[PDB]
mmCIF file of C-alpha atoms in Angstrom:
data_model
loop_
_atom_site.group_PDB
_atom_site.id
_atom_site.type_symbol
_atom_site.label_atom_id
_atom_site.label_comp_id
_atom_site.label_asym_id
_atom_site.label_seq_id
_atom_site.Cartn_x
_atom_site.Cartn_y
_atom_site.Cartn_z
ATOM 1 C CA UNK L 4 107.645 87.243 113.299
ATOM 2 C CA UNK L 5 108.048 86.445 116.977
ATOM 3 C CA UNK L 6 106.603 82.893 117.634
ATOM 4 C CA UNK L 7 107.908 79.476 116.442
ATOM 5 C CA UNK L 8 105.216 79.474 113.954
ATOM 6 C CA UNK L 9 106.211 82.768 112.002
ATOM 7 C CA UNK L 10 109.519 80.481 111.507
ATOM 8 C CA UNK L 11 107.997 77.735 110.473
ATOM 9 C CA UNK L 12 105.517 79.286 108.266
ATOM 10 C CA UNK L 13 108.603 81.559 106.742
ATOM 11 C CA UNK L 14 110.948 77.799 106.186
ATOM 12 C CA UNK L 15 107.092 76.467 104.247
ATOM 13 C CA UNK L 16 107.096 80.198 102.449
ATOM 14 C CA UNK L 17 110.670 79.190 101.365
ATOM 15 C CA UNK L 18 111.155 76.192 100.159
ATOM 16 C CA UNK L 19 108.349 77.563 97.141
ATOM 17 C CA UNK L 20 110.393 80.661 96.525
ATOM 18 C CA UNK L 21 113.673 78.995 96.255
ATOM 19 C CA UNK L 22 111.917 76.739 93.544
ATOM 20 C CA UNK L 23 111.220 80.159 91.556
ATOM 21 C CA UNK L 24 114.794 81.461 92.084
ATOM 22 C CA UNK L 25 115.907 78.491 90.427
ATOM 23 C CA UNK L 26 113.710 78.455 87.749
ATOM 24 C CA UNK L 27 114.826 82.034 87.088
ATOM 25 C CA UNK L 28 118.537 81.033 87.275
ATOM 26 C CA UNK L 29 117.736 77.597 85.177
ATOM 27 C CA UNK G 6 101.277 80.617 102.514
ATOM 28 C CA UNK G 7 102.019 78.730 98.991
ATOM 29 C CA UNK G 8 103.173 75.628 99.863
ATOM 30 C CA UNK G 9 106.243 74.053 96.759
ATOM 31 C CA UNK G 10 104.259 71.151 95.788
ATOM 32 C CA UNK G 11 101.365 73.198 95.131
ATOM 33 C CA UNK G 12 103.613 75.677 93.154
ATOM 34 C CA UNK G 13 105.508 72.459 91.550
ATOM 35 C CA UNK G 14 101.844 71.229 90.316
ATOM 36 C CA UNK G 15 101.177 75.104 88.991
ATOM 37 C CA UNK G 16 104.207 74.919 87.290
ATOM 38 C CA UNK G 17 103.787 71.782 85.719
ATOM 39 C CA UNK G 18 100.586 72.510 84.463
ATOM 40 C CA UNK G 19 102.294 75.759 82.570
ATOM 41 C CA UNK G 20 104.499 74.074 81.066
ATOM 42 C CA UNK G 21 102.460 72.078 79.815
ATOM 43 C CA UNK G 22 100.233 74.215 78.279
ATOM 44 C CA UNK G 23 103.485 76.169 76.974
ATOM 45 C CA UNK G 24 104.623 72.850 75.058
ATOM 46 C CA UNK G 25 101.186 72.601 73.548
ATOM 47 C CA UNK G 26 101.214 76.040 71.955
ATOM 48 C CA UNK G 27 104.699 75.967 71.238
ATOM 49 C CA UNK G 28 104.161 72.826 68.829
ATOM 50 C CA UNK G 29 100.187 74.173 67.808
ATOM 51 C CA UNK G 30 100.515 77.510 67.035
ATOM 52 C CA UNK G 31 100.258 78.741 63.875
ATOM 53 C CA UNK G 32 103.814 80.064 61.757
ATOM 54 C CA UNK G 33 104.550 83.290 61.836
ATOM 55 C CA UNK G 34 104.506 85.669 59.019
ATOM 56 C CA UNK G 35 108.185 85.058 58.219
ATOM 57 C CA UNK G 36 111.319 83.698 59.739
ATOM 58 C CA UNK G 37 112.360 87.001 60.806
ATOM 59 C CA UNK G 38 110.556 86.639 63.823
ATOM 60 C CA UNK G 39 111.916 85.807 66.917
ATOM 61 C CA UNK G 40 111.541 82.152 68.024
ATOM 62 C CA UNK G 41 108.620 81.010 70.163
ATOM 63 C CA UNK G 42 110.465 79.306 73.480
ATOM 64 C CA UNK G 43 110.280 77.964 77.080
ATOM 65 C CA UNK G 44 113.215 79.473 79.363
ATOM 66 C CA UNK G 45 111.685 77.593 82.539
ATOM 67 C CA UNK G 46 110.316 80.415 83.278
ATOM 68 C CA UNK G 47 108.361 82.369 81.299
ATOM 69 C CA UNK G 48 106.627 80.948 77.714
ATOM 70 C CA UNK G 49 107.727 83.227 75.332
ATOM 71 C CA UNK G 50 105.507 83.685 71.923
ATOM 72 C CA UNK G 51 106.768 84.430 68.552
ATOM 73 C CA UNK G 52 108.507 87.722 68.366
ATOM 74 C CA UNK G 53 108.243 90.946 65.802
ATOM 75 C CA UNK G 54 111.834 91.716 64.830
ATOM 76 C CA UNK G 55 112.813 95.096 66.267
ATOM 77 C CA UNK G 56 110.174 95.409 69.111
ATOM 78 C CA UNK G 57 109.527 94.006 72.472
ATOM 79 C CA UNK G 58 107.771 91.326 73.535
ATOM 80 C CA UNK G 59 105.486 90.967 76.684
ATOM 81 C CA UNK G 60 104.333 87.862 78.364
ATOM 82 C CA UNK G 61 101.765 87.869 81.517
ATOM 83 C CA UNK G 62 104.009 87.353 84.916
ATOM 84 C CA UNK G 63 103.936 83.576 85.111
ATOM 85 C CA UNK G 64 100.495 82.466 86.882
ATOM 86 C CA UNK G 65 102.041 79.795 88.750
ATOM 87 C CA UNK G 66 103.929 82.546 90.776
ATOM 88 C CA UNK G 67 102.994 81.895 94.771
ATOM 89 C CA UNK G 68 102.736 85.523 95.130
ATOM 90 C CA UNK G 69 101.100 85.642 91.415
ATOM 91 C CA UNK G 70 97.918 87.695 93.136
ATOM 92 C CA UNK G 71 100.305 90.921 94.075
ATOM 93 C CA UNK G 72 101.679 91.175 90.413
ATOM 94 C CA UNK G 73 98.246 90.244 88.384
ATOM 95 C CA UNK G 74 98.956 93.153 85.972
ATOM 96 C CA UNK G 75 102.791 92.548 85.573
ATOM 97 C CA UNK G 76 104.536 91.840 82.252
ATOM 98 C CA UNK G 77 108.028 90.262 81.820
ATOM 99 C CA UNK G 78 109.617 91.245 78.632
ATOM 100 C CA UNK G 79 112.369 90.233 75.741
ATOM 101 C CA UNK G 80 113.484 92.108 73.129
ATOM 102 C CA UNK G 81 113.421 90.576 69.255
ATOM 103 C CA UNK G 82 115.972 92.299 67.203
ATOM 104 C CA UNK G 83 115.904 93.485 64.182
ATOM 105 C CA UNK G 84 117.872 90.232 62.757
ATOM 106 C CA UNK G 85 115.015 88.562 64.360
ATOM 107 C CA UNK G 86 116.875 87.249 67.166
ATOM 108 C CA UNK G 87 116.634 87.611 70.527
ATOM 109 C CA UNK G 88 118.635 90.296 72.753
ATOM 110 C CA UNK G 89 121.262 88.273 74.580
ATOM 111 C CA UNK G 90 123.000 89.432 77.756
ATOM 112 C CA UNK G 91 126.600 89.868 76.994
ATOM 113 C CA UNK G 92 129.224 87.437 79.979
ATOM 114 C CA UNK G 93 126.022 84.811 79.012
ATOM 115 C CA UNK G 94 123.996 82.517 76.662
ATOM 116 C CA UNK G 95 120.896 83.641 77.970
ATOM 117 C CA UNK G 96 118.515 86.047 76.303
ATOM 118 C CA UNK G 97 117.589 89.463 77.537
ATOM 119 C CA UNK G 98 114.863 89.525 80.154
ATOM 120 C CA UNK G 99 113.081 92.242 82.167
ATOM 121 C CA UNK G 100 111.170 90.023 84.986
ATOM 122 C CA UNK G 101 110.785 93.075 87.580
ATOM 123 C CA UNK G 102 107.064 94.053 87.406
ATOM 124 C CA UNK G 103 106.643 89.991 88.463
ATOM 125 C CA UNK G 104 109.137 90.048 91.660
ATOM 126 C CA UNK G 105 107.764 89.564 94.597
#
């Protein structure tokens, strides 16, 4: 988690688990 | 990692299936069973009135590989509806074992 990769790979990582939150709140 | 669009397409696809056995599957033994449904989640069967109910943690899941034994899990009452959570509409729901 120390090169500009990590972050980008986290934002990718994200953007699916956000999309499960909400299906869990939906 | 799991990219959405691939987890979009998984999820699709289980829903999918879900709608086909929720209009296929046989009746239950009586109408006091619990209602088969799809909370967006989680396809939920059929339930025996006054016992729990146990579904496989959704395989659609990106991190579906580190819970492949979970269970998330509703309660049918004896009335033969679900448990609700009280300050809601929504029903009852255990999804822990499938967290990430």
């Amino acid at each position: 988690g120390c090169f500009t990769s990590d972050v980008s790979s986290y934002l990718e990582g994200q953007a699916a688990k956000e999309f499960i939150a909400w299906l869990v709140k939906g | 990692t799991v990219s959405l669009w691939e987890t979009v397409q998984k999820w699709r696809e289980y829903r999918r299936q879900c709608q086909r056995s929720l209009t296929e599957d046989p009746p239950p033994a009586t109408d006091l069973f619990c209602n088969r449904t799809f909370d967006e989640y989680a396809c939920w069967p059929d339930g025996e009135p006054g016992s729990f109910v146990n579904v496989s943690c959704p395989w659609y899941l990106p991190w579906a590989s580190s819970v492949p034994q979970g269970h998330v899990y509703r309660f049918c009452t004896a009335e033969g509806l679900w448990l609700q959570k009280d300050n809601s509409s929504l029903p009852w729901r255990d999804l822990s074992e499938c967290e990430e």
